[PDB]
Design a protein around this nucleic acid. Structure first.
Ligand SMILES: [Mg+2]
Ligand SMILES: [Mg+2]
Ligand SMILES: [Mg+2]
Ligand SMILES: [Mg+2]
Ligand SMILES: [Mg+2]
Ligand SMILES: [Mg+2]
Ligand SMILES: [Mg+2]
Ligand SMILES: [Mg+2]
Ligand SMILES: [Mg+2]
Ligand SMILES: [Mg+2]
Ligand SMILES: [Mg+2]
Ligand SMILES: [Mg+2]
Ligand SMILES: [Mg+2]
Ligand SMILES: [Mg+2]
Ligand SMILES: [Mg+2]
Ligand SMILES: [Mg+2]
Ligand SMILES: [Mg+2]
Ligand SMILES: [Mg+2]
Ligand SMILES: [Mg+2]
Ligand SMILES: [Mg+2]
Ligand SMILES: [Mg+2]
Ligand SMILES: [Mg+2]
Ligand SMILES: [Mg+2]
Ligand SMILES: [Mg+2]
Ligand SMILES: [Mg+2]
Ligand SMILES: [Mg+2]
Ligand SMILES: [Mg+2]
Ligand SMILES: [Mg+2]
Ligand SMILES: [Mg+2]
Ligand SMILES: [Mg+2]
Ligand SMILES: [Mg+2]
Ligand SMILES: [Mg+2]
Ligand SMILES: [Mg+2]
Ligand SMILES: [Mg+2]
Ligand SMILES: [Mg+2]
Ligand SMILES: [Mg+2]
Ligand SMILES: [Mg+2]
Ligand SMILES: [Mg+2]
Ligand SMILES: [Mg+2]
Ligand SMILES: [Mg+2]
Ligand SMILES: [Mg+2]
Ligand SMILES: [Mg+2]
Ligand SMILES: [Mg+2]
Ligand SMILES: [Mg+2]
Ligand SMILES: [Mg+2]
Ligand SMILES: [Mg+2]
Ligand SMILES: [Mg+2]
Ligand SMILES: [Mg+2]
Ligand SMILES: [Mg+2]
Ligand SMILES: [Mg+2]
Ligand SMILES: [Mg+2]
Ligand SMILES: [Mg+2]
Ligand SMILES: [Mg+2]
Ligand SMILES: [Mg+2]
Ligand SMILES: [Mg+2]
Ligand SMILES: [Mg+2]
Ligand SMILES: [Mg+2]
Ligand SMILES: [Mg+2]
Ligand SMILES: [Mg+2]
Ligand SMILES: [Mg+2]
Ligand SMILES: [Mg+2]
Ligand SMILES: [Mg+2]
Ligand SMILES: [Mg+2]
Ligand SMILES: [Mg+2]
Ligand SMILES: [Mg+2]
Ligand SMILES: [Mg+2]
Ligand SMILES: [Mg+2]
Ligand SMILES: [Mg+2]
Ligand SMILES: [Mg+2]
Ligand SMILES: [Mg+2]
Ligand SMILES: [Mg+2]
Ligand SMILES: [Mg+2]
Ligand SMILES: [Mg+2]
Ligand SMILES: [Mg+2]
Ligand SMILES: [Mg+2]
Ligand SMILES: [Mg+2]
Ligand SMILES: [Mg+2]
Ligand SMILES: [Mg+2]
Ligand SMILES: [Mg+2]
Ligand SMILES: [Mg+2]
Ligand SMILES: [Mg+2]
Ligand SMILES: [Mg+2]
Ligand SMILES: [Mg+2]
Ligand SMILES: [Mg+2]
Ligand SMILES: [Mg+2]
Ligand SMILES: [Mg+2]
Ligand SMILES: [Mg+2]
Ligand SMILES: [Mg+2]
Ligand SMILES: [Mg+2]
Ligand SMILES: [Mg+2]
Ligand SMILES: [Mg+2]
Ligand SMILES: [Mg+2]
Ligand SMILES: [Mg+2]
Ligand SMILES: [Mg+2]
Ligand SMILES: [Mg+2]
Ligand SMILES: [Mg+2]
Ligand SMILES: [Mg+2]
Ligand SMILES: [Mg+2]
Ligand SMILES: [Mg+2]
Ligand SMILES: [Mg+2]
Ligand SMILES: [Mg+2]
Ligand SMILES: [Mg+2]
Ligand SMILES: [Mg+2]
Ligand SMILES: [Mg+2]
Ligand SMILES: [Mg+2]
Ligand SMILES: [Mg+2]
Ligand SMILES: [Mg+2]
Ligand SMILES: [Mg+2]
Ligand SMILES: [Mg+2]
Ligand SMILES: [Mg+2]
Ligand SMILES: [Mg+2]
Ligand SMILES: [Mg+2]
Ligand SMILES: [Mg+2]
Length: 84
RNA sequence: CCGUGAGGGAAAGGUGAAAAGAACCCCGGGAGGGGAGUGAAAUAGAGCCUGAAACCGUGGGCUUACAAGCAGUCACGGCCCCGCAAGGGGUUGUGGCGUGCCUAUUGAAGCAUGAGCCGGCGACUCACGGUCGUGGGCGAGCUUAAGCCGUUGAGGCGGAGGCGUAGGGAAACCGAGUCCGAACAGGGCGCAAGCGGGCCGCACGCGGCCCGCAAAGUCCGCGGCCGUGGACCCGAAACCGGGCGAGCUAGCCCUGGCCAGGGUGAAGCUGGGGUGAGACCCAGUGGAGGCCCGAACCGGUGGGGGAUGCAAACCCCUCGGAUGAGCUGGGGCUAGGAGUGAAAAGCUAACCGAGCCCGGAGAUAGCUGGUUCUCCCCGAAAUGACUUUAGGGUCAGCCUCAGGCGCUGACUGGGGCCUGUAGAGCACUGAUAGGGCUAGGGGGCCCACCAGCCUACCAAACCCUGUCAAACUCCGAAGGGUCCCAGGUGGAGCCUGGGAGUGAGGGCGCGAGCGAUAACGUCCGCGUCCGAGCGCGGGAACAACCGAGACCGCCAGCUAAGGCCCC
RNA sequence: ACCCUCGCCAAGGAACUCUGCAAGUUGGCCCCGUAACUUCGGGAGAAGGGGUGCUCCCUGGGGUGAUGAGCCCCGGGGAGCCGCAGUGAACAGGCUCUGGCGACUGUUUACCAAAAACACAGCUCUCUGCGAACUCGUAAGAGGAGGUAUAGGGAGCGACGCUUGCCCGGUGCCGGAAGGUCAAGGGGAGGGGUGCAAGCCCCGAACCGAAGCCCCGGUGAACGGCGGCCGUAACUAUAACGGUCCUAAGGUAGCGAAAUUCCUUGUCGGGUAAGUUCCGACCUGCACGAAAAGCGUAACGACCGGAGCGCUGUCUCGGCGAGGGACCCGGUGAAAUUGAACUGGCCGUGAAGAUGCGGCCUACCCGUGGCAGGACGAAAAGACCCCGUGGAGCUUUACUGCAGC
RNA sequence: GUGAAAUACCACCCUGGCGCGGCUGGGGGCCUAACCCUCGGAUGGGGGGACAGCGCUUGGCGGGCAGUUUGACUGGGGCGGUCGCCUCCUAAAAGGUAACGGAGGCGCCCAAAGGUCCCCUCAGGCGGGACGGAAAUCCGCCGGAGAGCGCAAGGGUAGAAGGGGGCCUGACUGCGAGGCCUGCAAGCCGAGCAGGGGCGAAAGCCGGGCCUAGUGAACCGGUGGUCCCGUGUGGAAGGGCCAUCGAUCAACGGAUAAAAGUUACCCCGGGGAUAACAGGCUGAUCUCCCCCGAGCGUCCACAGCGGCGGGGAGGUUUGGCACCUCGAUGUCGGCUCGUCGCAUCCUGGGGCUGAAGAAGGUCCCAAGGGUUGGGCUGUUCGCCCAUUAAAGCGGCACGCGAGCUGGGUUCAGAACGUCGUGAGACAGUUCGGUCUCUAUCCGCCACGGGCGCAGGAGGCUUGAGGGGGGCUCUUCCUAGUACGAGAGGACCGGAAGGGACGCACCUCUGGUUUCCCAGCUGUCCCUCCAGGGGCAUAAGCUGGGUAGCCAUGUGCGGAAGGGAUAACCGCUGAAAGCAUCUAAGCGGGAAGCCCGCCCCAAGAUGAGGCCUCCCACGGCGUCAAGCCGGUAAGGACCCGGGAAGACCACCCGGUGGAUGGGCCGGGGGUGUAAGCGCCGCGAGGCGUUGAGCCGACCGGUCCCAAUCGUCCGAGGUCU
RNA sequence: UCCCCCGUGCCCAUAGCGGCGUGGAACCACCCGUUCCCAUUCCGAACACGGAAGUGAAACGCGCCAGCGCCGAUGGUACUGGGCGGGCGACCGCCUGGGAGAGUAGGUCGGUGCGGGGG
């Protein structure tokens, strides 16, 4: 029988997964309120017809379609062009 | 029958209508038989109706001493037996193929569990509630309970009462509304039920009778599941109550008995010495003692033997005590958290860390085991979250059934983005070898403070050449995710409800961790098989490797993997 | 064959083995003669020897008679005889030296432990003033005890000898009229509910209210604690000597690799040809120590160790003999176990150890006496281990109660 | 003047103390009459005495007792660690994703670090700069973000979320379309409407904070409001609703308001879901060999060695894993009995040597056979003693407990040290402690029975194929010679002895010999003396002792010899005009291999061979047995026996006979019988006398017994 | 329509940085002042106001260059959906789709709408 004293650790704790990311991709029809993106920082700037919540939480406020737009060094966006 | 006792507690029924129960003869000591006789029957002949199976025999048919096996099965052949025949029955000589049943498991022929064999007993029920479903009755309603009257396998009556017809509010309360609110803002519960439709009074009107069974419910029957009950059956170690036990053992009380023979020779006495008397020294006597040796007796030291024993503690040899804290008969007392204990938790009626019996009692058992007829359709799980949870559970995932919805499913084509792995690359964060240049610092020529000069040492920052990274990224695929439009009629999908089981997984491939890039290792990810395909072919044999999804039959055909010299 | 119980054995003589386990040796009686040590009783059966039959002769005591003979009972001296052998058979200690542990005789785990365990005389502490304390019991009552401090109860140690240090901080026990806190109850400033009111109901601050704990002193043959760390003497080492502290204080004597020593077969010495044991020492005591006593001690022990002598079948190393079985016949006639069996070897393979798969090898059918490697042989639903929100016994400054005070 | 502060006088009061008095409490003392105890029985006398006892109630102490609690995870369990939340990675470019994987944080804080309006832009690099480090604050360029943002990390960010200033409190109330996330309930984003506000000219923005941790369901209660309910009525008490409070319920989905240990005195239910043994897988560790050649070896890498490092094999170590076995796979050491491997301790062959010889070293070939006795410890192992040719290393469930032992270890007792308050405990010690007559199958050793072997018999045989056995030392002669300065000291060949072992044997030596002989004791008996018998073991004791069986005793054995080979050494010889053992062909060469030697053996169904015997159909089916009863050669049965033997078998006899028993002779053992005579008082001693008795052995002799008989068994299938 | 300038957006480096031109007629800026609205942590620097002598110096606008920055092929690899194989293993190969990053050739000192003033 050999079980010499067994060492120990500690750094064995992690955090809960937050399921962040883009929740609605361009072309998708969305009602007002539908929280499109749900990032942490400003990865995606609020576009026309879009609203930013406490946590930069992007959400549409107009019943229409979705669509992004890369402005280069101006940061990406995500406006919901109205179903006109 | 068992136990001292409380108490436990069996087994065992059948001649025949009628004893008519077998006179008598024969073998025999008898038993038992053979005749005779009774009877419808005696293989109804006496523990006798019927009398199965295991088991034991006698006779016959086939067949066996060079073969080897989960005992069979498929194929021919021989012998025997039926029938006219075709055909069939029994046996088994060769050949081919073949890893018991149950259980439990990731996995069993398994050298894991259970079973000697046969027969008989042996486990998912019942009551009342609940929830679905279903066969009926009546339905803006339905229905009685106790009890009464009747029957004597006759039903009636009985509206107390219960559900249902209004939802809301914590409530007062209001009401198709209501609750929060100041609010005709909002919002949470709520409601908004006709008719597929024959007929027909026979208004150019459908009334409304009718209808499914609803608006819509109830009642009764049946079935599934749930709750409370022992709630599928068997099983604890234990807990508690009332009793029975000291004829075993422990301790004390009373009253009686037993201890061959020897050995040793305490104190005392007496005598002789002794001295001034004494002490004291000698003998002698004496007969003390948890004294000695050793039978009885009481012990149980070592060894052997015994080990389904002579024996549930024995036998043999050898040992301890043996006038003592000794041994022993009879009569008595103390007992279950109690007694007793020269103290081992010993002993308390052959298992005492808490006696035995009966009772609570069918204790509880998230554990183990077992769970009995046939066929047909579908068919899992071994994951996640939480759990005094981790071999148990609740919800979800996956299975199934009923009803509803009807192209929405998996998969695929075309669009649009979402992303930072592979790879690569240093621009960031760090790591990097050498070289250049160059703050310093050893230190060096030193004209000595004013700098200075040199240095195959140390050495920043910075540039050049070479690289490194899961927690680096200037960059970045393949793919993957999702939405839209299209294909796609599948034991596809979606919605509502009834029944689950599963929450130990395993091997292989690939992508990571751990490990020591060891493990038939371990932990996740996708996939796939096994599981449940220990069904079939290949791989010598072999759950998961290659082939391939077994409804049944065929003395037909083409193939798969793998093969094509013989086996 | 083998097993039991018994007999003998050449040469050796413990080389056997955990161990002289077993067996043998020795064994009665008489006479010589016996060591250390000692509590002067012992150790004494210490050891170590010698004698032991029978015949004849002589002779002394006693008991009974009678003082005599007989008959009994103890002796003393002489000669001689025969065996391998004279307690001629049976009953019948092997001895010694040295340690440990208990004093001694004794008691105990009925059925694996007889002991260094219990007990024990003796020592100390403590309670009890007698309706004693304590024990049983609800109570009455009873034991204590028809006892009374030279008694009882409880506790530890355990003859005897020399002794039994240091620390009272904490726990316990004894004593304690300062103080802290604390129950019922008392007391009621003040406040409340209702009544038209008198009222009737309540709440409630000061303050007064027991043991208890805290506190203060004592107490060790009360529970207990006695670790360390620095400095220091004519090499070196050591430290009589000083200092230090979270605690209260830091091991006095005596013992010591011990029933205690991890390192360890410590290191010296002894005994042996050779010694992890043993004996005597040293002291680095992992982790002795004074009454859960320290250190000794004659005597005692079916206790445990180590050595010698003796003698052996223990062994080298077996042999033969005997009897009771085993074997065969007649009689009688069990058992655990058992899925069924038509039950072989090797390499493999397989849930990792197959008579049963594969390939090969071997192999006529059926018994009888033997052996014990396999049938993961039998027996017992592993006593170890883990699991179960299983169970019991026991402990305490775990919780919560209760008796008792 | 001193002091912090001033004193004559005047007061209001405070501190503490003493008196006399109300309020409330304590503790004594005396009394007797309740209660208690006592006196030769007492309506009474003593003693205690309102205490004690006893009732109700307060608080206390309280393992003496009772009921219980003492978590989970976990590469077994325990010990250690951990348990909720946040960041990054692992995570395989959506989301999610595990491990006792890798690395860090949280259990707060801010009234300004909040709302809004208006301004401002950093860090560093290089210059130049009073104290000024290498960053204080300045000035000038250059600098898109590397600074800053309360704290971890990440994301984000100057077109501000950063830095400053002004008013402010939206860190609102009533709501809340629509979503993210999700088992449950929780978490999260939030436009928009209403009420009443803040800042801005206005557009507008404000329902805390750049963002992601800073947290806790329910239950039970507290405090404000509510006016909702309030037990006949009214009011109250008490609830409800709204708001808010008390959680290291941190084991962080939270069992009770309330909880630790121990068991070797232990018990049940389960598990090979899970540890200890053995096996299995693996091979880090272990053992072994190989590659490289620093560098040692006077010189020289490789005689012998081998730095740093590298590649392997084995599966005997210590482990890892947790795969069969927990309705049981007995565990260390010894004994017994073997058997295998070779990585060889000895012995046999051989290469190189830093090999003169002798003795070594090293490597290659080679297990055929060997591989000692003791002291110590339970030991394995080791250390010693004395030897040896050597005192090999491993495997077989660390071989072997239905084979033995039980000394070590693991049950109950007891003690030491030590840990614990304790009960108890300790890979610490110490003494003690029940290891189960029966073998069914396989396997193994032996012995039979049946049938077969294609006529039946009685003999003798061949040997396919098995088994046994294989050892080694010393001395002498070659020759004190080759070799060697010397000391020492061989090969090859040839002898004689040993040791262990094996088979057989009993002449000898030495055992045993259970009644062969003698001697002896006690007792009972026959028959009194004498002479005898039983018993004192299953021999009473003692001394002897044939046959048989035996070792300590005796004789033999290992071979010799032939053949093929290992390493190794060559001949001839190309490819490659040389060289080369190789490619073709040929040799030499081991205790090893084959055969030789001893033993078994034709169930060698492949059933063999040789010699000799007896042979016929006689009655009867499918006409050579497919058939019956006598037969034949022969064979059993039965009997007498046996150095044969458990039984069976095998061998020898059976009256034509020496088989056993007896009798006779001889061996052989006892060691002078009885009786009688002589001497002695007697025990005894002479003599007759090597007498008597007398198993098995070597033989004679029909005296007794193997009387007499019976039953099987050919008639022999095919070209 | 066409050049120049002034405001504004889009594209977000081939849209810039840095050198070298040049421009003021107009617009713009610098300036002249700062009594007044308004100001600075202190400065009219910056905001702000009233102006108009001088100027293009600054700043800005518009050209020029490739050196830094940036952009960046084509080929060929890497890697990889899917399919099929090899090695004891560490790993690796063929088929079929997709297909980088670096590197090289080379590209660039912008393009462009709406409204104003002016030739
Ligand atoms: Mg917001
Ligand atoms: Mg009885
Ligand atoms: Mg008749
Ligand atoms: Mg009948
Ligand atoms: Mg009848
Ligand atoms: Mg019958
Ligand atoms: Mg054959
Ligand atoms: Mg045959
Ligand atoms: Mg099972
Ligand atoms: Mg399963
Ligand atoms: Mg089996
Ligand atoms: Mg089985
Ligand atoms: Mg089981
Ligand atoms: Mg079963
Ligand atoms: Mg049955
Ligand atoms: Mg049955
Ligand atoms: Mg019902
Ligand atoms: Mg039951
Ligand atoms: Mg009772
Ligand atoms: Mg009694
Ligand atoms: Mg005595
Ligand atoms: Mg008597
Ligand atoms: Mg005995
Ligand atoms: Mg015995
Ligand atoms: Mg015995
Ligand atoms: Mg036995
Ligand atoms: Mg005695
Ligand atoms: Mg009891
Ligand atoms: Mg009872
Ligand atoms: Mg008692
Ligand atoms: Mg006793
Ligand atoms: Mg007791
Ligand atoms: Mg008993
Ligand atoms: Mg109990
Ligand atoms: Mg009950
Ligand atoms: Mg039960
Ligand atoms: Mg049950
Ligand atoms: Mg359950
Ligand atoms: Mg199906
Ligand atoms: Mg359907
Ligand atoms: Mg479609
Ligand atoms: Mg698509
Ligand atoms: Mg990479
Ligand atoms: Mg389906
Ligand atoms: Mg699981
Ligand atoms: Mg698992
Ligand atoms: Mg699991
Ligand atoms: Mg696995
Ligand atoms: Mg693996
Ligand atoms: Mg499947
Ligand atoms: Mg399969
Ligand atoms: Mg199978
Ligand atoms: Mg196959
Ligand atoms: Mg099918
Ligand atoms: Mg074909
Ligand atoms: Mg002898
Ligand atoms: Mg002798
Ligand atoms: Mg010895
Ligand atoms: Mg020995
Ligand atoms: Mg003895
Ligand atoms: Mg005599
Ligand atoms: Mg007399
Ligand atoms: Mg005697
Ligand atoms: Mg004696
Ligand atoms: Mg004796
Ligand atoms: Mg004693
Ligand atoms: Mg004694
Ligand atoms: Mg006993
Ligand atoms: Mg004793
Ligand atoms: Mg005993
Ligand atoms: Mg009382
Ligand atoms: Mg009395
Ligand atoms: Mg004591
Ligand atoms: Mg003793
Ligand atoms: Mg095998
Ligand atoms: Mg088979
Ligand atoms: Mg047999
Ligand atoms: Mg046996
Ligand atoms: Mg066995
Ligand atoms: Mg009186
Ligand atoms: Mg009185
Ligand atoms: Mg009185
Ligand atoms: Mg009183
Ligand atoms: Mg208790
Ligand atoms: Mg992801
Ligand atoms: Mg992915
Ligand atoms: Mg939700
Ligand atoms: Mg009221
Ligand atoms: Mg192994
Ligand atoms: Mg079993
Ligand atoms: Mg070799
Ligand atoms: Mg030589
Ligand atoms: Mg065995
Ligand atoms: Mg033992
Ligand atoms: Mg023993
Ligand atoms: Mg003993
Ligand atoms: Mg042969
Ligand atoms: Mg053969
Ligand atoms: Mg002889
Ligand atoms: Mg002899
Ligand atoms: Mg002799
Ligand atoms: Mg007699
Ligand atoms: Mg003889
Ligand atoms: Mg040549
Ligand atoms: Mg040759
Ligand atoms: Mg030759
Ligand atoms: Mg044969
Ligand atoms: Mg033959
Ligand atoms: Mg023949
Ligand atoms: Mg004869
Ligand atoms: Mg004769
Ligand atoms: Mg003679
Ligand atoms: Mg003779």
């Amino acid at each position: 029988a050999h079980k010499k004293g067994l060492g120990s650790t500690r750094n064995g704790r992690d955090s809960q997964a937050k399921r962040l990311g883009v929740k609605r991709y361009e072309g998708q029809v969305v009602r007002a309120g539908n929280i499109l993106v749900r990032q942490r920082g400003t990865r995606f700037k609020p576009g026309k017809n879009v609203g930013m919540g406490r946590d930069f939480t992007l959400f549409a406020l107009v019943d229409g379609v979705v669509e992004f737009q890369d402005r280069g060094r101006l940061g990406r966006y995500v406006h919901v062009r109205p179903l006109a």
